[PDB]
């Protein structure tokens, strides 16, 4: 039947504890989270149409205790609406607790809480970068495959009040109309090339004019004038993206026409970066809240 409130309560019990303390749900509880959230994802559009006010977060990458701190600053649900831009698993020590809390909040408040797909919500990536190993050690392989079946149904992009375009990676040279996003059928894997790939993998680059090759070996880079023509063609004010670690937790691009959000401080036990969360009120007036390392 899925005791959501008991799951959420145990996930929050370690709030304020020796950072790194595990929450070991049962296998059936986690599978219930995956099966229920998967239903909700498929029942909602692959291109979300959201409305302010809300708070937007970037990569978490298994830093569960930093995620709990974000909620302390911005208000635990349902006090605030939330949109996460992807990359919940891999790299960090506690991907499981991270993704379970987010899925539980998705099930609990399916209209005030939203999760986008990042490039790490993909079996071929998170098999390698930590999530699979965490599943093997703490549960079993079959649970990882259940997570994959859920990740394959995550929405890809969101538009907030018809003026803010949100995705994990960035723009595609194959993105002519938002209909190409709505057309993608779920469940799906992330292809090695094309629109869905670029939406999860591409980066902005100040030294590129049109489209350049991406250092990652996947997808493309895009320049400041690609942003302008996109925003103008689709009557938008801002592109909100993640996917890239940034010193301040946020970083503007192309005269504040694009912003990069990263929410995991001291990423990979390195960098000494900070994390940021972007608050949007109902007027579409936007601000940043900074999460410094701890």
């Amino acid at each position: 039947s899925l005791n959501l409130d008991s799951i959420i309560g145990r996930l929050l019990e370690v709030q304020g504890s020796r950072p790194g303390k595990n929450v070991q749900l049962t296998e059936n509880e986690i599978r219930g989270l995956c099966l229920k959230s998967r239903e909700i994802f498929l029942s909602q559009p692959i291109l979300l149409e959201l409305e302010a006010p809300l708070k937007i977060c970037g990569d978490i990458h298994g830093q569960y205790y930093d995620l709990l701190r974000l909620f302390e600053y911005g208000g635990f649900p349902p006090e605030s609406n939330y949109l996460f831009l992807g990359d919940y698993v891999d790299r960090g020590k506690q991907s499981l607790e991270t993704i379970c809390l987010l899925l539980a909040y998705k099930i609990k408040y399916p209209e005030n809480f939203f999760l986008l797909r990042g490039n790490h919500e993909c079996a071929s990536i998170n098999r390698i970068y930590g999530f699979y190993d965490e599943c093997k050690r703490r549960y079993n392989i079959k649970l990882w495959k259940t997570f994959t079946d859920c990740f394959n149904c995550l929405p890809i992009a969101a538009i907030v009040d018809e003026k803010i375009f949100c995705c994990h990676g960035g723009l595609s040279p194959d993105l002519q109309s938002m209909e190409q996003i709505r057309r993608i059928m779920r469940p799906t894997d992330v292809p090695d090339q094309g629109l869905l790939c670029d939406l999860l993998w591409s980066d902005p680059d100040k030294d590129v004019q049109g489209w350049g090759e991406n250092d990652r070996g996947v997808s493309f880079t895009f320049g400041a004038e690609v942003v302008a023509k996109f925003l103008h063609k689709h009557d938008l004010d801002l592109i909100c993206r993640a996917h890239q670690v940034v010193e301040d937790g946020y970083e503007f691009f192309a005269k504040r026409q694009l912003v990069t959000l990263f929410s995991a401080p001291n990423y990979c036990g390195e960098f000494d970066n900070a994390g940021a969360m972007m608050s949007v009120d109902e007027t579409l007036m936007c601000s940043f809240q900074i999460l410094k390392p701890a």
Binding site: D203, F252, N273, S287
Partner: peptide, 23 residues
């Protein structure tokens, strides 16, 4: 509506902030 920014938000596009991709 229109996206505007609060008076305390700093524009850091040209301030030489560090960025990175993989670890």
């Amino acid at each position: 509506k229109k996206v505007e920014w609060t008076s305390d938000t700093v524009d850091n596009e040209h301030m030489g902030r560090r960025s990175s991709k993989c670890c």
